[PDB]
């Protein structure tokens, strides 16, 4: 399925989409996208939207 993740970050903003099996793995690989441009946020996932989001 398609996953959604908004950043909201002090340096990196916008919106970015992965397809994924389940949630747990759509967020592994925004947490590691997020990991690898250097953002420490809060996490939230929404079952709903299919969306996370990371604000810094």
Not at 31 to 48: C, L, P, R, S, V
Request: proline letters at 0%; aromatic letters at 10%.
């Amino acid at each position: 399925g398609q996953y959604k993740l908004i950043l909201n970050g002090k340096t990196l903003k916008g919106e970015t989409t992965t397809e994924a099996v389940d949630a747990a793995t759509a967020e592994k690989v925004f947490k590691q996208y997020a990991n690898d441009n250097g953002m420490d946020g809060e996490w939230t996932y929404d079952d709903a939207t299919k969306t996370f989001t990371v604000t810094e």
